[PDB]
Amino acid sequence: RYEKWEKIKQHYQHWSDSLSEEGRGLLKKLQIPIEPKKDDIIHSLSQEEKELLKRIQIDSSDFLSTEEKEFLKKLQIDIEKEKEFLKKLKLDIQPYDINQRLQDTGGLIDSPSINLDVRKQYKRDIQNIDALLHQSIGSTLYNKIYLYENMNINNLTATLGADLVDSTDNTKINRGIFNEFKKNFKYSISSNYMIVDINERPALDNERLKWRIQLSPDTRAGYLENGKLILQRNIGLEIKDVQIIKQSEKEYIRIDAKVVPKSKIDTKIQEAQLNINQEWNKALGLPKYTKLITFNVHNRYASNIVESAYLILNEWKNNIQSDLIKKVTNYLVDGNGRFVFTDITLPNIAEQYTHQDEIYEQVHSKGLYVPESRSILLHGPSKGVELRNDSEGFIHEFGHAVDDYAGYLLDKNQSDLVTNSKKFIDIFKEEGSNLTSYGRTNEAEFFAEAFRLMHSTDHAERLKVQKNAPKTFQFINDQIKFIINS
Ligand SMILES: Cc1cc(S(=O)(=O)N(Cc2cccnc2)[C@H](C)C(=O)NO)ccc1F
Numbered sequence: 321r322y323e324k325w326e327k328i329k330q331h332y333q334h335w336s337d338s339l340s341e342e343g344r345g346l347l348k349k350l351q352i353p354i355e356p357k358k359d360d361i362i363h364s365l366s367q368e369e370k371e372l373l374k375r376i377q378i379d380s381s382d383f384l385s386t387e388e389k390e391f392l393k394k395l396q397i398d399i400e401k402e403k404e405f406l407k408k409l410k411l412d413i414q415p416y417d418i419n420q421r422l423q424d425t426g427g428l429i430d431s432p433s434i435n436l437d438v439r440k441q442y443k444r445d446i447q448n449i450d451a452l453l454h455q456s457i458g459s460t461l462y463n464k465i466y467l468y469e470n471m472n473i474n475n476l477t478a479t480l481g482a483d484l485v486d487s488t489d490n491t492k493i494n495r496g497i498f499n500e501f502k503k504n505f506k507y508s509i510s511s512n513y514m515i516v517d518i519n520e521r522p523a524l525d526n527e528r529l530k531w532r533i534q535l536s537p538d539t540r541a542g543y544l545e546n547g548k549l550i551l552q553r554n555i556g557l558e559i560k561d562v563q564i565i566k567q568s569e570k571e572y573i574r575i576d577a578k579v580v581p582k583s584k585i586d587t588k589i590q591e592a593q594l595n596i597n598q599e600w601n602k603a604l605g606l607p608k609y610t611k612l613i614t615f616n617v618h619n620r621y622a623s624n625i626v627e628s629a630y631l632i633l634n635e636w637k638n639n640i641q642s643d644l645i646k647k648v649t650n651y652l653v654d655g656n657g658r659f660v661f662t663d664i665t666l667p668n669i670a671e672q673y674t675h676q677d678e679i680y681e682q683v684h685s686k687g688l689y690v691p692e693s694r695s696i697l698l699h700g701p702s703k704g705v706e707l708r709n710d711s712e713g714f715i716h717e718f719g720h721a722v723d724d725y726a727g728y729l730l731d732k733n734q735s736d737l738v739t740n741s742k743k744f745i746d747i748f749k750e751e752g753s754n755l756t757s758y759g760r761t762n763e764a765e766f767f768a769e770a771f772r773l774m775h776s777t778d779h780a781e782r783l784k785v786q787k788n789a790p791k792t793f794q795f796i797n798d799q800i801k802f803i804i805n806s
């Protein structure tokens with residue numbers, strides 16, 4: 321367990337000694353992100369904002385992560401309509417987390433999804449760390465050691481992660497879900513600095529993935545003491561093996577991976593993008609030069625993001641009538657619209673942030689539709705709230721596109737969503753709470769939810785829309801009729 325520490329340490333002896341006080345402080349910053357302290361958030365608040373914050377019920381919020389919820393509760397401890405307030409405040413409670421910024425952006429750190437000042441600080445730190453990690457592990461040690469990293473399955477796929485652990489016995493891995501996770505896991509990208517161990521360490525709470533990694537001779541790294549290494553960012557990983565193993569009467573998933581040039585992985589992704597486009601331009605009868613599908617892939621479940629795109633579009637094509645699909649998609653293409661499949665957060669997708677300067681209006685979620693760029697965005701790793709799979713999410717987003725085109729058809733000059741018409745507003749006011757809880761949010765979301773359920777494989781769901789929201793059901797069919805006759 322400790323026999324290999326010394327020789328790795330001695331290899332990086334001079335590197336460690338020559339570290340400046342700032343270089344060291346930077347490595348500590350990377351290991352321990354800086355949380356915002358409560359008292360400064362509070363004193364920054366005005367006394368009209370303070371009074372507002374404590375009267376706010378907070379677990380109710382739809383767009384705040386459980387850590388963000390808990391934090392603001394502790395602010396209430398010390399002290400809808402104004403979602404306005406929680407969206408602005410959400411930005412000022414993010415920890416300074418270098419590795420998380422790199423992962424969220426996939427290395428596209430110029431993405432205007434955080435404030436300018438911190439955005440520029442992130443750049444400076446990243447460039448400084450890149451300069452620190454100059455010494456490769458080398459030929460004397462690369463094949464003499466293994467590097468280990470424990471990982472939460474939710475980091476790769478939160479959808480499969482919900483059922484990965486056997487519900488009848490939590491010491492076991494669900495064999496069926498295991499196969500799904502392993503099936504299309506061929507390669508992997510690290511856009512941030514992997515922090516790995518020289519020897520294997522016991523997994524912490526809900527960590528069931530245990531990586532075993534072999535570096536290449538040229539792979540640059542730094543020693544972080546206590547038998548721990550930090551790897552250079554932007555490295556490719558080839559998955560050599562995925563197996564279920566048992567440690568201390570508990571089942572884990574071993575992932576054997578080998579470091580390769582990231583460019584080698586990027587080449588496969590680019591080849592896959594050409595293939596899926598040529599294949600789907602033909603199926604949809606689009607012009608042969610159309611670029612519709614785009615892979616924005618930069619993270620550790622890389623190969624599955626690509627492979628699942630094929631299946632998502634297949635389910636999409638299978639569950640929606642052909643003529644509706646063709647009409648709407650050709651509308652999207654006429655405005656250079658894209659189907660974006662990605663494993664970076666959606667505010668870092670150009671098809672969103674280009675048309676959304678306000679960060680507090682920027683949205684991260686499983687799926688999104690942006691009318692200004694006529695694009696559908698689908699985020700792999702995450703799990704949509706009250707959503708079975710990615711295909712159902714994509715169908716929902718396509719509902720928004722249907723909404724867009726239908727409204728465009730009735731006035732191309734003053735182009736607007738059909739759900740913004742007084743006609744559907746009245747329908748939403750009457751039937752808006754008769755479907756999903758989230759459908760209640762607004763006209764567009766109610767429309768897209770209704771559209772999703774009307775095209776669900778569960779025929780019972782389709783009948784529940786016609787029975788509980790017959791006016792919305794009728795309205796949508798009228799838009800479909802309007803579209804295919806256009
Ligand atoms: C139910 C379903 C959900 C999604 S979502 O989670 O990504 N989402 C809705 C959402 C997000 C957070 C909590 N509650 C609902 C985003 C924002 C959206 O509407 N996309 O256009 C996407 C598609 C769906 F069908």
Ligand SMILES: [Zn+2]
Pocket residue numbers: 716717720764765768
């Ligand atoms: Zn939506």
